[PDB]
A paper describes a structure:
[name] ([name]), belonging to the TRIM family, serves as a valuable model in this field. Within the nucleus, this 70 kDa [name] protein molecule has the capability to assemble into a super protein complex, known as [name] nuclear bodies (NBs). [name] NBs participate in various important cellular pathways, including DNA damage repair, transcriptional regulation, self-renewal of stem cells, regulation of p53 stability, cell proliferation, apoptosis, and defense against viral infections. The RING and B-box domains are zinc-binding domains.
In this study, we report the cryo-EM structure of the PML46–256 dimer, which encompasses the entire RING-B1-B2 domains and a segment of the CC domain. After multiple rounds of 2D and 3D classification to eliminate heterogeneous and incomplete components, we determined the cryo-EM structure of PML46–256 at an overall resolution of 5.3 Å, with the core region slightly better resolved (~4.4 Å). In our cryo-EM model, each [name] monomer comprises helices α1–α7 and beta strands β1–β7. Unlike other TRIMs, the RING, B1 and B2 subdomains are folded together, centered around the [name] α3 helix, resulting in a [name] monomer. The RING, B1, and B2 domains are arranged surrounding the α3 helix and are distributed on the outer surface of the [name] molecule. In this inner α3 helix, residues F108, F109, L112, and L116 form a hydrophobic core, intermittently mediating the engagement of the [name] RING, B1 and B2, respectively. The current cryo-EM structure revealed that the [name] monomer, which serves as the basic unit for assembling [name] NBs, forms a functional [name] dimer via two α6 helices. Specifically, V123, F177, and L178 within the α6 helix from one monomer interact with their counterparts from the other monomer, facilitating this dimerization. Additionally, two SUMOylation sites, K65 and K160, are located on the outer surface of the dimeric PML46–256, giving ample space for [name] SUMOylation. Despite the prediction that the CC domain would be a long helix, the density of the C-terminal CC residues 236–256 were not visible in this [name] dimer. Furthermore, based on the current model, the C-terminal S221 residues from the two monomers locate on opposite sides of the [name] dimer, facing away from the dimeric interface. This suggests that the two [name] CC helices following S221 might be positioned on opposite sides of the [name] dimer, resembling the arms of an octopus.
Numbering used by the authors:
A (entry chain A), B (entry chain B): 46 to 190, 201 to 221
The structure:
């Protein structure tokens, strides 16, 4: 399994992320990428350590999709698509062209902001970089209501400067 | 000519750059990308408006290769390779794997800093994004003596914060 090694690089749990440690975050402190996953980013409930189940490997909660959006921010600035890593990731059935979201409402929000960051099927198959460059230059949009952040719920080029910690 | 349109996007003159205007620069003010090309970035000589010839379309001067390095910074953070745009760009004969430099000494410097940002032939042919992601995560190096800047002549993740204007 060639592309299977892409996540074995970190033994990721049904997710994909190239950076083992973000140099900055909207949360309190920079730590191992799994630290904010081991315990919810902003969830004060006893479910924050996901004793009942984690959302990123399988949809569990809307607030725990904050982790999904956190990973999706990095995948938006530069996309380490899990589909190329794992074409079986299409089991979600690809409701929309943007990755690292679920329940169709984060997708609908990316649409509301006309800020899809769509990874087309041609991009999912990893055969081109022209569309990648297009999406990259589009990372800085000129419309609103640059890339989404749930805390403020608005496009922000890098909410790391905000330190939202919603 | 499919890939020929990539530079016709801006009618570029024997060069490649996706951003028609950098949102920030090490120079004085943000302007059209051609403004700093019409007149040298830091050259006070009467040759700054390249009446004798421009360096970016064809090697003319070492100080005018500051433009080459400026474009190469953007192409390093995200690479709009002219080779995919124009496979004839290999006429340089590909002395080394990094693009947007000449005279082999900027290349030797990228090597000195163990900071090649090499675009392998597999990447030149535009068939993969895994090596791109590798080089991207390597954009932030852990060695020195992150990406080169001639003014200080040292790796800088974004010399825009420095406003070098050497």
């Amino acid at each position: 399994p060639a592309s299977e090694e892409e996540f074995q690089f970190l033994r990721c749990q049904q997710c994909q992320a190239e950076a083992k440690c973000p140099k900055l975050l909207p949360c309190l402190h920079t730590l191992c990428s799994g630290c904010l996953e081991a315990s919810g980013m902003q969830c004060p409930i006893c479910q924050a350590p996901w004793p009942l189940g984690a959302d990123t490997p399988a949809l569990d909660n809307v607030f725990f999709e904050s982790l999904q959006r956190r990973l999706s921010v990095y995948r938006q600035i530069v996309d380490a698509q899990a589909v190329c890593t794992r074409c079986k990731e299409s089991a979600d059935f690809w409701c929309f062209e943007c990755e690292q979201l679920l329940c169709a409402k984060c997708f609908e929000a990316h649409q509301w902001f006309l800020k899809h960051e769509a990874r087309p099927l041609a991009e999912l198959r990893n055969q081109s970089v022209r569309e990648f460059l297009d999406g990259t230059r589009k990372t800085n949009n000129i419309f609103c209501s640059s890339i989404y952040c749930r805390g403020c719920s608005k496009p922000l080029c890098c909410s790391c400067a905000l330190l939202d910690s919603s």
